[PDB]
Amino acid sequence: YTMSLGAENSVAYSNNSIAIPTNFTISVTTEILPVSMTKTSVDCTMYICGDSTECSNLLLQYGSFCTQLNRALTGIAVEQDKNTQEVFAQVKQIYKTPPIKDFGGFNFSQILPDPSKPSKRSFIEDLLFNKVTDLICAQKFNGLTVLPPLLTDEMIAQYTSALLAGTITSGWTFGAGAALQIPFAMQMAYRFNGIGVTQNVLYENQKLIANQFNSAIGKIQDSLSSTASALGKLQDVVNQNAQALNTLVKQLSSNFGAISSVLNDILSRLDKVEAEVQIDRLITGRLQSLQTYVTQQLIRAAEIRASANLAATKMSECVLGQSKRVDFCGKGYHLMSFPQSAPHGVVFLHVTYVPAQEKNFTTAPAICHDGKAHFPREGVFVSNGTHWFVTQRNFYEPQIITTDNTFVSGNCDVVIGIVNNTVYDP
Amino acid sequence: SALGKLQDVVNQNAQALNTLVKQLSSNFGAISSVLNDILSRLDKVEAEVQIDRLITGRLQSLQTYVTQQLIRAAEIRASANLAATKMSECVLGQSKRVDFCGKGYHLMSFPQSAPHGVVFLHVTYVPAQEKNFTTAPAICHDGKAHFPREGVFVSNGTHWFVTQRNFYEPQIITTDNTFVSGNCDVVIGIVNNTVYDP
Amino acid sequence: TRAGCLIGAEHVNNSYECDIPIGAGICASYQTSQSIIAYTMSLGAENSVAYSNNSIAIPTNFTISVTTEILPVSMTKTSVDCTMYICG
Amino acid sequence: LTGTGVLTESNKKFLPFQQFGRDIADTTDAVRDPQTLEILDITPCSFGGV
Ligand SMILES: *[C@@H]1O[C@H](CO)[C@@H](O[C@@H]2O[C@H](CO)[C@@H](O)[C@H](O)[C@H]2NC(C)=O)[C@H](O)[C@H]1NC(C)=O
Ligand SMILES: *[C@@H]1O[C@H](CO)[C@@H](O[C@@H]2O[C@H](CO)[C@@H](O)[C@H](O)[C@H]2NC(C)=O)[C@H](O)[C@H]1NC(C)=O
Ligand SMILES: *[C@@H]1O[C@H](CO)[C@@H](O[C@@H]2O[C@H](CO)[C@@H](O)[C@H](O)[C@H]2NC(C)=O)[C@H](O)[C@H]1NC(C)=O
Ligand SMILES: *[C@@H]1O[C@H](CO)[C@@H](O[C@@H]2O[C@H](CO)[C@@H](O)[C@H](O)[C@H]2NC(C)=O)[C@H](O)[C@H]1NC(C)=O
Ligand SMILES: *[C@@H]1O[C@H](CO)[C@@H](O[C@@H]2O[C@H](CO)[C@@H](O)[C@H](O)[C@H]2NC(C)=O)[C@H](O)[C@H]1NC(C)=O
Ligand SMILES: *[C@@H]1O[C@H](CO)[C@@H](O[C@@H]2O[C@H](CO)[C@@H](O)[C@H](O)[C@H]2NC(C)=O)[C@H](O)[C@H]1NC(C)=O
């Protein structure tokens, strides 16, 4: 079938019709970003000339290929830890959540560490670590060793916990300097004021907002626990590295024009003057395989470095602040985001403000009362059919058009579409 | 160690050429590394056998060098795009992005030239001396709730004031500073205080 | 250690800043008598923000700080003669 | 079959026609002694990066 781009939606556009949402729904979306990959340390001499003497003497005649390959692999291994540190260590002081959960109704027990379990990770972090999963001995015996990262999972978990505690106890002031304590209600009020919504909406619907946030976190947990394809971006990198290692370790089973793929099968049959050609062919083939593997690893490391830089930018702009960039910190008006640890990656929980129920209204660009054009300071003029009001953009809260809400500029014969209405004077 | 990011680039660009020059001296299985030494001792039919090996080895070395240079140039192009973006944002304006134009609240930035690089002098606004205060979401005066327009309510123990979020400047809670919205029966944690009328 | 068996450095229990990264949370340093020591790298001073439902912190002063940032822009050009290099 | 490694008695039940044994990477990981009908695992000696 022909793929459908989406449902057709005809917008009822008009020169005097406006739609303002009368409600809202807090939506929490997830985003998976790779931060690092598995380190590799290929023993070039043991890979090309494993347990051989004449083979090493012949390989030394090629130059510094093994040296430059090991140097590139060491650079990759160093830059992986550099990316991990630049992503998960954006703060220089580990914070701790208070023992009392007097936030205002929001439930963060599902993202904060649990002292019961030994690993200081939360429930979502445990789910993410469980959703991501002898060839290892065969790779190790041929010279393919994996180096452990500098920061263990416990340190990354502690960093994530510190970031989460700083976000829930200080908002965004902990990134620009010292952490300043502030109730979570006032923090959410500041978040709502950032996206252009008056702070009274939160102080009037805090219970509904907390219930929606709890339901969203529960749905996120259920989605992460039900399906097995939410963390596909990290599993893709893991499988790519595993397949690269498998190809590099299975290329040793090729003849490359020689009589046998095993060096002992050649050194035990031919002499020191005829086996030189076969050993040279094997060395050439294995060195070409190593060069191809190193080039692929360099390209993949560049891609992972780009992804890690993007992840660190998203961390600094969504967790340690409130980014006004559209579709950056999740779809919708970004309020706040919570980082979560993941195997060789990072997972964000972007909390967004999404309008729910809109209604049609009649709008006017200006209002003339006594020959003077009045324009809204922060809002838009609306009409429910008989009366006129002034309300904010992202929420429906009608108010009487007074002098403290509108300003005077010009006259009536200059604005197109202006209608007549009285302007109250307090 | 201030210009280490540029020193590493220079060292890598020099070490690549050094490694290429050193691999020029390799034998690649031939009888000698010098081309003229092989071209002046063996006949054509026997010299071509070594010339082919030397050409193949040097061509492989050149291809490896070109691939490394292409990857390094891609990395440098990404870094240069990031630097140009930071220039156009911090220098030619005021970026509200957190931890982008330096740590803190970005005020302004001054560019500086550097060998094969650029140096930014990010000027940031960092609060230093903070104090504890008792806060409240809104104020109840005559049954109505008063929310701050731009600021937050604070209390030093006996009186209530309204001040901005990033600096301590207490002011009397007047009608010109706070607006009326809703009643005083839905807001959680609300308190009682008088609202001055000018 | 999880990375391997380190021989030549004394194991200490104090947590310092990671100077020489060894691996798996262990790092090395040259301290006091002088000898190489190995220790679990720390992450920072353990702080606890005094959070409350009626407590706020508002700064009363400020410090204007200037932080330098170095970013590479270009590198040295190199035009290798592909013919003279192989067939000088 | 010349090689170098540590020999250890294997528990792999080789059939009467099973002489040798290869690993995933086309490397001999098990061998049967010609004199004594015993199965021996072939494991390379201890090594690693320094
Ligand atoms: C905005 O939407 C929410 C979510 O649908 C509404 O909350 C529900 O309201 C209905 C009817 O009042 C109740 O039966 C449900 O129990 C409510 N759900 C929750 C989780 O509280 C809310 O009423 C809507 N707001 C307005 C003004 O219509
Ligand atoms: C946050 O949510 C969790 C999970 O829904 C709550 O934990 C529940 O606590 C009650 C009372 O102690 C137990 O009966 C339930 O069995 C718990 N649920 C689970 C899944 O263990 C927790 O109480 C909530 N936070 C607050 C402050 O109420
Ligand atoms: C449009 O809004 C106005 C303002 O509230 C409504 O006028 C009020 O309507 C209610 C019930 O219809 C009356 O009890 C009030 O006395 C009216 N106020 C005034 C000042 O007359 C009006 O009904 C609304 N119209 C529609 C179609 O919703
Ligand atoms: C708003 O009021 C003004 C006058 O108060 C209206 O202007 C009148 O328009 C009619 C019809 O075009 C003319 O016959 C009158 O001479 C106008 N009066 C003046 C003083 O110029 C205007 O039409 C009103 N606007 C609306 C939308 O009703
Ligand atoms: C809280 O601030 C108020 C306002 O500055 C203080 O009230 C003043 O106290 C001084 C000291 O006696 C008097 O001289 C002023 O006349 C008071 N002003 C007013 C308007 O009452 C109050 O003392 C402060 N409280 C604390 C505990 O510091
Ligand atoms: C703020 O003032 C209001 C009214 O002055 C207080 O509401 C009264 O509280 C008393 C004692 O709880 C009750 O007996 C009255 O019936 C209440 N009146 C009304 C109209 O609700 C309110 O308690 C004050 N706030 C605080 C924190 O004491």
Ligand SMILES: *[C@@H]1O[C@H](CO)[C@@H](O[C@@H]2O[C@H](CO)[C@@H](O)[C@H](O)[C@H]2NC(C)=O)[C@H](O)[C@H]1NC(C)=O
């Ligand atoms: C904010 O901090 C600055 C720097 O510490 C303070 O400036 C000092 O003020 C003291 C007291 O007058 C002087 O003795 C110092 O010489 C000042 N230092 C400098 C570098 O100017 C400033 O007073 C503080 N502001 C407030 C309101 O306390």
Ligand SMILES: *[C@@H]1O[C@H](CO)[C@@H](O)[C@H](O)[C@H]1NC(C)=O
């Ligand atoms: C607004 O008008 C359009 C077109 O008549 C209609 O499709 C839409 O449902 C209306 N909005 C509401 C909230 O009814």
Ligand SMILES: *[C@@H]1O[C@H](CO)[C@@H](O)[C@H](O)[C@H]1NC(C)=O
């Ligand atoms: C809006 O469009 C309708 C349809 O053409 C027209 O009749 C009306 O005059 C327009 N009003 C304004 C203010 O442009």
Ligand SMILES: *[C@@H]1O[C@H](CO)[C@@H](O)[C@H](O)[C@H]1NC(C)=O
């Ligand atoms: C605020 O209170 C906390 C907890 O008592 C205390 O640690 C902190 O020093 C106080 N702030 C100031 C500026 O004294």
Ligand SMILES: *[C@@H]1O[C@H](CO)[C@@H](O)[C@H](O)[C@H]1NC(C)=O
């Ligand atoms: C603040 O928290 C304390 C401790 O749980 C509680 O006693 C008090 O009632 C709370 N006040 C408000 C306004 O939530």
Ligand SMILES: *[C@@H]1O[C@H](CO)[C@@H](O)[C@H](O)[C@H]1NC(C)=O
């Ligand atoms: C470190 O702690 C362990 C565990 O108690 C102890 O055995 C050891 O002596 C300590 N080392 C030092 C240098 O204090």
Ligand SMILES: *[C@@H]1O[C@H](CO)[C@@H](O)[C@H](O)[C@H]1NC(C)=O
């Ligand atoms: C000779 O080899 C057979 C296996 O082929 C073995 O069973 C027997 O014990 C051996 N005898 C001696 C004397 O080594």
